[PDB]
Design a protein around this nucleic acid. Sequence first.
DNA 1: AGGTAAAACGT
DNA 2: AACGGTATTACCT
Length: 201
Amino acid sequence: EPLAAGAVILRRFAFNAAEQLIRDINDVASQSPFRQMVTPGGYTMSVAMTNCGHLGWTTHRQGYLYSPIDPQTNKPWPAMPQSFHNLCQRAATAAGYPDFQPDACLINRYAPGAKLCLHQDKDEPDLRAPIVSVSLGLPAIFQFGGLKRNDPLKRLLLEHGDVVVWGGESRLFYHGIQPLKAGFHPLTIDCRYNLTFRQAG
DNA sequence: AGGTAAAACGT
DNA sequence: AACGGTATTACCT
Ligand SMILES: O=C(O)CCC(=O)C(=O)O
Ligand SMILES: [Mn+2]
């Protein structure tokens, strides 16, 4: 369990809820489809993304931001599914964050080779609130460091149903995903999904 | 006067 | 391929 101060991995926590979560990913994506976002610097991200809930993480020319509106559809992001919110609440409570109320869920899709380079989650104004991160499908190596980029990384395999929660002291810690290895999973076929819940408003 | 982009090539 | 440069710079608010 003990990843860092205020950080924990709940292994296979979402395993039982996974089938329903995956159906709801498909429902969300049918309204706001997965898209590979382009950085301010002009590079297309390997991870395909969408959002649900009140606020969605996005890139544009000027930087990163949380928007109530999907810039692709010009409609609000789909409502956060009850299955998402219920799972998130249970995970956060188990992790020691019983008062967490997310208003934002970023949905990441990793094809073979897709990565997410070391970054901080910092576009949220209320830093008191934790991050809840659900793994679905193919396994990936999760990097978890410290407050500085060059702080040593813990490398952890995240498997289908694993939930990682950080906050408090570890809230602004650098973290990332190494290039996804190809493979098969009975529920996702050829990809990894990640659900990242935050308080963005 | 701060916050931010790099959530993205060489050794 | 793990590690670290780049952003002690050029930009908007
Ligand atoms: O895919 C993951 O496990 C991490 C996702 C992430 O870091 C993010 O969406 O900010
Ligand atoms: Mn992140």
